[PDB]
Subunit: 194 residues, 2 copies
């Protein structure tokens, strides 16, 4: 059960999250919970760890810049983090808010949440399931989601590659800064597109 | 004169380069020589250093992988370079072939050639002139070259930003690895698009 990892039931957590998140964002988390479970079954990841990490991944999406900055200092995180924003923070720093609020201590779950946005050069299968589930969950409808879905039905590694390529391409198209760890992910996985 | 920097006249160099490069690539170098001179006048860079670096930037474009690998060892370059190819090598490693063949010792010229493909987080005005001249030289006709040209008429820094964004966007679109120093350039310059 979820109480095996956190300080409340799934139902209690959902009530908590309905307070913290707009309806669309909660619906997203619910979709990721479901998609993570499906991927975990396909690729031999603990379905329960996957479901829970999937539900929790965007827990900290609505924290303010001020809160994240507090957390960086208190937890003595990489100082460079101040140069970034929500996109990087909600996973990389947001895991600390999760730990505080829910007493989550499992390192594998914490890590999968931590890098859900940016990835890493080395990712566990659980990290990959969450990274991909976020992108393919049933509520998403962005052009090309169908391709991501088909890829993910066959290969976790190629799904990570496709999503990361698309993200880098779009950030450059938009003229947004690219977190260097995103590029570590890109370069590690891009060969899977071949 | 060019003999102020290298071991032969401009005419002798052109004869040398006609041996080393296909006609299209030599025509490109000639275009970059011209474009570098124009940019240097606009942005207060030594026109002679700019012209010479512009002409020489793609000198080593046709070396074989084997030659570059020799040069990496002999000059004891970053070992990671072996993981890459021509695109990175022809500037980053190719500067050594230039030094050997032509007795080029000027550090500013050598540096502008070195990073003409990948840029750096910190670039001298000369580095920027070469980086941009390569992209806007009159023989180029890629869609959007007109925009690059207009930008470069106003701002060296914004031209670096636009070119780097386009390069990162296209590499991700194609599913090609991105040299980490390219991202250093991207993140340093991307703010200029605003
Ligand atoms: O290096 C970076 C910098 C920014 N973003 C952006 O972060 C946002 C949120 O990404 P996530 O995968 O966490 O999805 P969401 O929380 O919106 O479901 C997206 O708009 C990304 O383009 C990113 O993915 N990588
Ligand atoms: O991190 C990288 C990896 C590859 N390339 C590629 O290197 C090639 C040559 O770039 P350059 O600016 O040296 O132009 P050229 O020599 O073709 O005139 C282009 O196709 C680029 O997309 C790049 O610019 N950055
Ligand atoms: Fe997220
Ligand atoms: Fe999400
Ligand atoms: Fe080049
Ligand atoms: Fe060139």
């Amino acid at each position: 059960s979820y109480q095996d990892y956190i300080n409340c039931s799934r139902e209690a957590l959902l009530e908590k999250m309905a307070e913290l998140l707009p309806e669309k964002r909660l619906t997203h988390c619910l979709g990721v919970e479901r998609a993570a479970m499906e991927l975990a079954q396909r690729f031999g990841v603990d379905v329960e760890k996957a479901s829970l990490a999937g539900l929790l991944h965007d827990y900290a999406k609505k924290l303010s810049d001020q809160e994240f900055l507090v957390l960086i200092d208190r937890y003595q995180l990489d100082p460079d983090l101040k140069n970034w924003g929500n996109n990087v923070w909600h996973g990389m720093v947001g895991i600390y808010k999760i730990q505080e609020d829910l007493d989550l201590h499992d390192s594998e779950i914490l890590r999968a949440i931590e890098i859900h946005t940016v990835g890493a050069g080395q990712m566990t299968d659980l990290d990959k399931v969450i990274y991909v589930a976020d992108y393919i969950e049933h509520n998403r409808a962005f052009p090309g989601v169908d391709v991501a879905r088909e890829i993910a039905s066959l290969s976790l590694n190629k799904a990570v590659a496709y999503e990361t390529a698309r993200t880098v391409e779009y950030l450059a198209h938009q003229g947004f800064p690219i977190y260097p760890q995103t590029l570590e992910t890109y370069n590690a996985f891009v060969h899977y597109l071949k």
